Amino acid sequence: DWNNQSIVKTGERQHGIHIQGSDPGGVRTASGTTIKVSGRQAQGILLENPAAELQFRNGSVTSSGQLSDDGIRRFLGTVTVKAGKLVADHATLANVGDTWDDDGIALYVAGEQAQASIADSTLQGAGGVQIERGANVTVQRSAIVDGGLHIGALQSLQPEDLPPSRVVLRDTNVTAVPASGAPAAVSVLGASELTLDGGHITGGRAAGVAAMQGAVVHLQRATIRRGDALAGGAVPGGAVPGGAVPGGFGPGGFGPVLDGWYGVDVSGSSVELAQSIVEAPELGAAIRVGRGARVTVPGGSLSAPHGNVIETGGARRFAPQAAPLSITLQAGAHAQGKALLYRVLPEPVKLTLTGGADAQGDIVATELPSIPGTSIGPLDVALASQARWTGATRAVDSLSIDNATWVMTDNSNVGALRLASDGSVDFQQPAEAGRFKVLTVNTLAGSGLFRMNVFADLGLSDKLVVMQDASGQHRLWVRNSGSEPASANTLLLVQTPLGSAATFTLANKDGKVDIGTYRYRLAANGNGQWSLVGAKAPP
């Protein structure tokens, strides 16, 4: 059709290849062809026919004019598909227009009958790839070199309708260079769906990946870092940003809605991370959740060494009606930060760790933004099936520990503590002697295990305080963390209300623990205290 040819156009809206609405349907093929356009409102490729298809293989497409759209708002791409199917294979696509004079979009696919299949190609330009309004796009073994990947929209009040944009990426890297002022490297907004398997996602002014307003995202075998750089025309300057330009009705590159640097920023949407790596900068968080967001993470890693693994916000008013924020780490997911979780606004939060999830850091919250006590949504956390949480809190309302463990690293406050099937609270052995900890809780229930440190020689031990109601059948295992005692001393391990039904048994071998020449056994004389008593051992 247009094989091994050079198409060079310079006039206003003088496209390299244009398949119109008044043209016939059918497959057009281009192989070994290079397209270069520079006129105003001229794309390299323009597809506007639902029955048409274009196979563009082993060629290159470049444009440098302002690709402003006649219909209010919008900028188009060097390759734009408004209807029909584009199949690009081993292609070199580049929008080389002034950053100033144009959005630099390399590929724009929009509409219910707009489709695109991109394989083994590179897409260059500061506006990246923009997909919306029910388009369907598959991208394989490629790379969006510097403008990022932007699916869907918000605001833009203009005749709308039905289907979601559906985008599938496989082994394709996406980078949003600082120049390309894209808020996120990958943004999925509104009725949009993204499936990503394999690939490196780097950049974004405010986030690596942003999922807003009903978006549905599925990341697998991916890495999400803030760092990056490059992609483009020639070598002038790196990223304006003292630019500020003609072009018309068009933003650098889309999103976001919140800012600082978050690996994954989810609001009113759902994101699934599977075997991926997320690295947050000192300032920010691996994952930020708001407005009923749902995030799930099997395997992989979440690291925020100098910050928060998870940040929860989005919603200034708590409403019992609405569904809470939900974060689940399962299938051996690893997480590590100063704070595992950090609450910023009053919306309820549910944090679940299961399937050998291994999380590290404290759970922190922000006292109160005036909203009277019961105007604050609860912070509930659940540990199950071998998961492990090592950190401390003063902000968890309820904690269930079922066949999993909480390694408590410092004095902690928990509203209601429920244990089951060998769930345990392990009072971490301190580095310094006599540095006992206190776990204070309102209620205790179920059947669990507490590993508690005893400093016989100082007459000190860790302590469990239940202020309102202790019930259940629990076990206490004593860790000899000091030296031998020189006389008989008794340690107050557990304080419970006088009536309390709870029962505690020493789990140490034979119901006793020998430290030096002293033997300690657990005793309760009905008053609400459980004490490790300890007396001279028998010869």
Curated annotation (Swiss-Prot):
Region (5 X 5 AA tandem repeats of G-G-A-V-P) residue spans: 232-256
Position of sequence motif Cell attachment site: 226-228
Localisation per UniProt entry: Secreted; Cell surface
Sequence repeats mapped onto the chain: 232-236, 237-241, 242-246, 247-251, 252-256
Protein name as it appears in the record: Outer membrane protein P.69
Organism, scientific name: Bordetella pertussis (strain Tohama I / ATCC BAA-589 / NCTC 13251)
Lineage of source species: Bacteria, Pseudomonadati, Pseudomonadota, Betaproteobacteria, Burkholderiales
